[PDB]
Amino acid sequence: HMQTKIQKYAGTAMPYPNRTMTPFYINHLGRHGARFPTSRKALDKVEKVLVSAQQENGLTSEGMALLSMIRRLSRLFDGQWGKLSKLGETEQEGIAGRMIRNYPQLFSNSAKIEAIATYVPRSINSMDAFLSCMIRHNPALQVQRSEGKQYNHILRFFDLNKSYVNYKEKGDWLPIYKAFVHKKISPVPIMKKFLLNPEQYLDKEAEEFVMALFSVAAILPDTSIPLNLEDLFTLDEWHRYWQTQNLRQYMSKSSAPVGKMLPVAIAWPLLSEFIRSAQEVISGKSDYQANFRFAHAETVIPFVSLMGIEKTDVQVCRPDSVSVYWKDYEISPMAANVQWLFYRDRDQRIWVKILLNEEAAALPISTACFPYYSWEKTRIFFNQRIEMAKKTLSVFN
């Protein structure tokens, strides 16, 4: 289907997909829901280009239309940047709703749940929407709710690690990304529909215009604004745009060889915390029925690769090949989430199921009863992942 594939090409801007025994505990991490754009850079650039053209009589008919809409968008986004949208809230109500309905026993009576979020409002509002749905279904829940910079160590590790911040900003992946954009993004066919003399434009300025335009269009379906630009581009053009953003995500935030696993290793404190909270619930030190955490794409992506969920930590030496093996939209769409579901069988042995975006995920260890894995084997495996992460990090101060 062309419709679903077009949405995929929004990559990490993709709206959460459609998703329409009982565990004793659920361990959760969840990106905020669908949001407004975080930066006005792409919009202003697209507008600076159009408006400068409207002066030198350089706009086509479709060009004139685009500019009017771009100006309007500029208005609608004003003061709204980075905020959670109505769609974002409904995504959370739906995730929480499906959990409640699927495991009513878990959240029945006076179950205790705890939730944390980062200081980022879109993350907090996400938690709120998620929590509000839960309480509505069972007003008798005990709920502990908190948030702030004090969770920076486990929810924003990507800001704390000096080496990573240097890598993300000025590291070796940049030139690679930039050469790949040049190869894959053919600007002129696209600019031809908005501008007279598309050929007069420099590849650099042309490439920027067109990237900014893809970015605007990519984010629009997340704003709950009844406007659409997905139509300005052909499927192939979206395919190409996406391949480039996909490569950026992979190299900047995941297991690309050029990153040396630095982007993945930084998530070890979060994995560590996940294991502790489950162990404490297993021992009975804690007695929560669920821990929920609300954070970002930058939290989810490396976390998932660090968990070793199959096809997320792959190390692809060749850039042009990443799109085949690693799909950002499958990992970190809007409202992306990981849930560990813990079960106890008839003989008291603990099993765990790993859901990524509410689909059962695979680990590179064996089980006689997929999708359930032995908690003991699993924890040993995660503990190895963590120890590897600590070494990786030790190689980079």
Numbering used by the authors: 19 to 38, 48 to 424
Paper text:
We determined that prominent gut bacteria express homologs of the mammalian InsP6 phosphatase (MINPP) and characterized the enzyme from Bacteroides thetaiotaomicron (BtMinpp).
A second structure was solved by difference Fourier analysis at 2.42 Å resolution in which the inorganic phosphate ions are displaced by the nonhydrolysable InsP6 analog, myo-inositol hexakissulfate (InsS6), again bound in the active sites of both molecules (Rcryst 15.6%; Rfree 21.7%). Comparison of the structures of analog- and phosphate-bound forms revealed an rmsd of 0.20 Å for Cα atoms suggesting limited conformational changes occur between the two states. This conclusion is consistent with the sulfur atom of this group lying 3.1 Å from the imidazole Nε2 atom of the side chain of H59. Indeed, in our crystal complex with InsS6 one of the E325 side-chain carboxyl oxygen atoms is only 3.3 Å from the ether oxygen bridging the 3-sulfate to the inositol ring, the analog to the phosphate-leaving group in InsP6. We propose that H59 acts as a nucleophile for cleavage of the 3-phosphate from InsP6, with E325 in an HAE tripeptide being the proton donor for the leaving group. There is 52% sequence identity between human MINPP1 and BtMinpp for those active site residues that have an atom within 8 Å of the InsS6 bound to the bacterial enzyme.
